[PDB]
Amino acid sequence: FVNQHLCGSHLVEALYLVCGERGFFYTPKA
Amino acid sequence: GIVEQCCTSICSLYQLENYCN
């Protein structure tokens, strides 16, 4: 699920699944 | 940033993990 174009909610979902209990930061304008 | 790496281009696990806390 990571090796594709991931945008918007799809990208946030991937970060969520990958990062697990560490959580993540989503900074689309940085 | 992440949009350039994962949305506009093909994402990767390597790159996604760069944004984990």
From Swiss-Prot, chain A:
Give coiled-coil spans as residue ranges: none
**Domain of life from the UniProt record:** Eukaryota
* Name the record gives this protein: Insulin B chain
Per the UniProt record, the lineage of the source organism begins with: Eukaryota, Metazoa, Chordata, Craniata, Vertebrata
